[PDB]
């Protein structure tokens, strides 16, 4: 699977995705979580 696996915005919350070997990589901030930075670590009611 050597190619690009992030040509469809897999990560969110301003996640920095980068094309790497096999799969890709998303560099986010410590205040963000989720399988693809799609969740903000705000910790409110839920
Ligand atoms: C990509 O890296 C992450 C960690 C943030 O700094 C983004 O704003 C940047 O584009």
Swiss-Prot record:
Source taxon at top rank: Eukaryota
Disulfide bond sites: 6-17, 11-26, 28-37
Glycosylation sites: 8, 16
(3R)-3-hydroxyaspartate PTM positions: 19
Mutagenesis / variant outcome for changing residue 9 to A: No effect on O-glycosylation by POGLUT1. Drastic decrease in O-xylosylation
Domain EGF-like as annotated: residue spans: 2-38
Site positions (Important for S-112 for O-xylosylation): 9
Protein name: Factor VII light chain
Gene: F7
Part of the intact protein present: 105 to 147 of 466
């Amino acid at each position: 699977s050597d190619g690009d696996q992030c040509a469809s915005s897999p990560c969110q919350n301003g996640g920095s995705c980068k094309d790497q070997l096999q799969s890709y990589i998303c560099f986010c901030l410590p205040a963000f979580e989720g399988r693809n930075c799609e969740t903000h670590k705000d910790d409110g009611s839920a």
